[PDB]
Design a protein around this nucleic acid. Sequence first.
RNA 1: CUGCCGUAUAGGCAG
Length: 178
Amino acid sequence: TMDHYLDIRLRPDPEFPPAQLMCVLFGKLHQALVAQGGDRIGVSFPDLDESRSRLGERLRIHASADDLRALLARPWLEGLRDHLQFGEPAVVPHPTPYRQVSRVQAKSNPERLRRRLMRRHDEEEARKRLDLPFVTLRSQSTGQHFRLFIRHGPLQVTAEEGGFTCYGLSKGGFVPWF
RNA sequence: CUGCCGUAUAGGCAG
């Protein structure tokens, strides 16, 4: 169904490195996805460097002709349209391998894990008891900067039924990797 | 980072 996509490139900037730009971008897309609603908008990073742990300088936006045509018709790129080079929406080539672009979270800050352990079992007691490409974001509710880690899954011959979160990440859905 | 789910020092989530 999601046979349409659109690449967005981060135009080189003297003061802001690419990594910083992709952050802004991803945040922009997010705010617009919670506006669009639905779970049919995918996302991939074609320039993904699985070694250097860098997302790259390109954000591929997956969607159907209608869903995709509805997204970019919003003013979610006002702030950085001058920071972004992007063509028209085209149709994905085939045959194309499929993979998952999903968030990943590890367990750490035991001060945190233990605090929860205490809540669920009623500091001295508790105290006793990941290398991936990341985008850094800022929450709307509490003004905290958190690192959203992203991982591209092993290549598959097909795509299983699945949707996507308001960040365009895999909720179980697959995206064409090319 | 903060929190949620889960007996979990399993495995998962939310922003």
